[PDB]
């Protein structure tokens, strides 16, 4: 049963009455489900996977694009010399879990291998009907509210040897992060997280990094080499507001104690480079009151500096930007096939 491609039925238990846009969108675009999976193991079956070549990711991307476009309307948008203006009311915004259901005559496959790196053969394959609920969190650098690795930390790449390929780190243990625009400079914000917890996280990631690239290698984290503020900082949407957080303090570390919490300084911006398409959008000023989100860091997206030239050293920087890698981080274990 080879991999095939066809339009999918998304899924959500989203409530009809919740005026929040994800619930509102999911009710009109998605189906209730399940009511059951309900069970489908495939004995003695080995299957090759490729999370990096999965039509599901591209299709999902289109669903989340449509959601934002329908839900978070900018006052002004500029794309390809063309200008759009529209009403831009503030909304309630909080990613609900989303499932993705295969249509008739088709079925979904799940990789259950413990070490599974996202490419190549899987020995613990199983079928189903829908992937478990994915929160469509839009962010760079850090993966939020995702699913954790079952055993050890896992890192995945389309080509580890290709420095142009994004490295997806999946943590097996969450690090809580608290971001706030305090009540009563209305665009100034910050995030707090445990310094010690993060150091341990970096350490364990670094350990897996040494395992992949060579134990003779020295592992270094460095800040963004530059670009749009969206990828220089850890950015995310909280409560309809666009947060841009300085992650310098998160990504300055070497092998060779100060402070209980790490505090990242942040800004709320009205003017953003869009992730859905190339362009800029202006939104209305931030809402009043306390703005706060508590999220699980469940993974990371890294890129690695090439080189050479001296070698023996590997430098890693925070990355992201292409949200397809975000969806891939959850859909990596799945593929769609046609029953024949």
């Amino acid at each position: 049963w080879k991999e095939a491609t066809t339009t999918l039925f998304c899924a959500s238990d989203a409530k009809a009455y919740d005026t929040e846009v994800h619930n509102v969108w999911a009710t009109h675009a998605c189906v209730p489900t399940d009511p059951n999976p309900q069970e489908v193991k495939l004995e003695n079956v080995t299957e090759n996977f490729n999370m990096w070549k999965n039509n599901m990711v591209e299709q999902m991307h289109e669903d989340i694009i449509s959601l934002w476009d329908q839900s978070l309307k900018p006052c002004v948008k500029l794309t390809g010399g063309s200008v759009i203006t529209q009403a831009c009311p503030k909304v309630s915004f909080e990613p609900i879990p989303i499932h993705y259901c295969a249509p008739a005559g088709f079925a979904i496959l799940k990789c259950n291998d413990k070490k599974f790196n996202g490419t190549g053969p899987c020995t613990n394959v199983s079928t189903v009907q829908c992937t478990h609920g994915i929160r469509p969190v839009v962010s760079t650098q850090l993966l939020l509210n995702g699913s954790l690795a079952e055993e050890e930390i896992v890192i995945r790449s389309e080509n580890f040897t290709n420095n142009a390929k994004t490295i997806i780190v999946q943590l097996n243990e969450s690090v809580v992060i608290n971001c706030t625009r305090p009540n009563n400079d209305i665009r100034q914000a910050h995030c707090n997280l445990s310094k010690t917890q993060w150091e341990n996280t970096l350490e364990q990631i670094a350990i897996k990094l040494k395992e992949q690239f060579g134990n003779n290698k020295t592992i270094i984290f460095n800040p963004s080499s530059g670009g749009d503020p969206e990828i220089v900082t850890h950015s995310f949407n909280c409560g309809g507001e666009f947060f841009y957080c300085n992650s310098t303090q998160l990504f300055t570390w070497n092998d060779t104690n100060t402070g209980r919490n790490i505090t990242l300084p942040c800004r709320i911006k009205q003017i953003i480079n869009m992730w859905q398409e190339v362009g800029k959008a202006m939104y209305a000023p931030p809402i009043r009151g306390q703005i706060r989100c508590s999220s699980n860091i469940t993974g990371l997206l890294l890129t690695r500096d090439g080189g050479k030239d001296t070698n023996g050293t590997e430098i890693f920087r925070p990355g992201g930007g292409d949200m397809r890698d975000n969806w891939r981080s959850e859909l990596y274990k799945y593929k769609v096939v046609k029953i024949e």
Partner: antibody
Framework: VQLQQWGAGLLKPSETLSLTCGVY????????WSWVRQPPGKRLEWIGE???????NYHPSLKSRVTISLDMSKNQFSLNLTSVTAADTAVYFC?????????????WGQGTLVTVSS | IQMTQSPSFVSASVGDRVTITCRAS??????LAWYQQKPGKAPKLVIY???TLQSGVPSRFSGSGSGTEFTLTISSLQPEDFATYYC????????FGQGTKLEIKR
């Protein structure tokens, strides 16, 4: 599968409507269960739908007043509506949800006439 | 979202072919069913997903459409076919059309 309904249908304003729907020929397991009402001379209106998990799914025109529930020991489910007014006068139906998970409503209960007046 | 039908109270003779339409205010992809309802009784499922007949429903029934235009068709009305027909959006608010009452011409 057959759905039979019971419950008091003559109510006064500010009272609570409490109807029950019994399912015979099928289990509640892995099945959605819904309520729908039909005001006099008007079209059908979805009230809400439930699941074995416990997630309650209501209509926005009835959020703060409506409760839908499963009675798992009896394979029954119920609808509660508090502070009823004359505008809730309608025939109220229960209905099982067909799967695929394409929906929707089949089979249907026989309906209960509910009249709200003082 | 709004369901708009052909303006009901339609009158047609037995043996005649009849088609009633449902128009949605926004696009919907096969999230649609059609029901038949006679006075004093509960509705019965005729068609869902725009074009799929419910089991037991006679072949003279058919339905098509997607997006904003939908169709319920009876190739040849029988006395038992006379009724009020509703369209319904199968997701979102699960809203119904205002209904099309199908009466006997004479």
């Amino acid at each position: 599968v057959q759905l039979q309904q019971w419950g008091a249908g003559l109510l006064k304003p500010s009272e609570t409507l409490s109807l029950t729907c019994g399912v015979y020929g099928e289990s509640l397991s892995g099945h959605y269960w819904s309520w729908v009402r039909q005001p006099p001379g008007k079209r059908l209106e979805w009230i809400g739908e439930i699941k074995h998990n416990g997630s309650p799914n209501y209509h926005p025109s009835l959020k703060s007043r409506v409760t839908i529930s499963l009675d798992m020991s009896k394979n029954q489910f119920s609808l509660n509506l508090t502070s009823v007014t004359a505008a809730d006068t309608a025939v109220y139906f229960c209905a099982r949800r067909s799967n695929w998970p394409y929906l929707p409503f089949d089979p249907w209960g026989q309906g209960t006439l509910v009249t709200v007046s003082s | 979202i709004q369901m708009t039908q052909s303006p009901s109270f339609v009158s047609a003779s037995v043996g005649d072919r009849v088609t009633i339409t449902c128009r949605a205010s926004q696009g919907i992809s096969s999230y649609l069913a059609w029901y038949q309802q006679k006075p004093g009784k509960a509705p019965k499922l005729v068609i869902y997903a725009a074009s799929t007949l419910q089991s037991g429903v006679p072949s003279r029934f058919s339905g098509s459409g997607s997006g904003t235009e939908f169709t319920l068709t009876i190739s040849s009305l029988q006395p038992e076919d006379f009724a009020t027909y509703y369209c319904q959006h199968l997701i979102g608010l699960r809203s119904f059309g205002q209904g099309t009452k199908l009466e006997i011409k004479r």
